[PDB]
Amino acid sequence: PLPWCPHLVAVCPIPAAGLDVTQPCGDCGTIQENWVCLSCYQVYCGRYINGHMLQHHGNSGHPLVLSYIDLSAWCYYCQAYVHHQALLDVKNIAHQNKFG
């Protein structure tokens, strides 16, 4: 995984409501393999379910998404996982919600 990418500038502030790692897909309602968009904080499912987060990337151009299964961050433009200081706050808020 990359230690930086040129889309980190599109990571937006975390809503004051926080994250809900059990939130369903906003399109199909599945509870399985969802991701949260780090630009607009909508929640959509992964490629192995109904691919709604990939569709969101296509229709918005939003680059970076966070996995609610393992808290990895994927960039659709770079086609890589990214770790950076700029992702720690949102990873941490998710980790707290997920693990208690």
Ligand X SMILES: O=C(O)CCc1nc2ccccc2s1
- 2 SS3 class: strand
Distance of alpha carbon 80 from alpha carbon 76, whole angstroms? 7
Calpha distance 29→43 (Å, rounded): 10
Q: Which is nearer to Zn ion, 51 or 99 (CB)?
A: 51
Alpha carbon distance 26, 84 (integer Å): 27
The interface region with Zn ion, picked from 15-23, 46-54, 66-74, 87-95 by CB under 5 A, is 46-54
The site partner of 11 among ligand X, Zn ion, none (C-beta below 5 to 8 Å per kind) is: none
Nearer to ligand X, 22 or 55 (CB): 55
13 versus 100: smaller Cβ distance to Zn ion: 13
Residues of span 38-97 touching ligand X by CB under 6 A: 46-47, 53-54, 65, 74
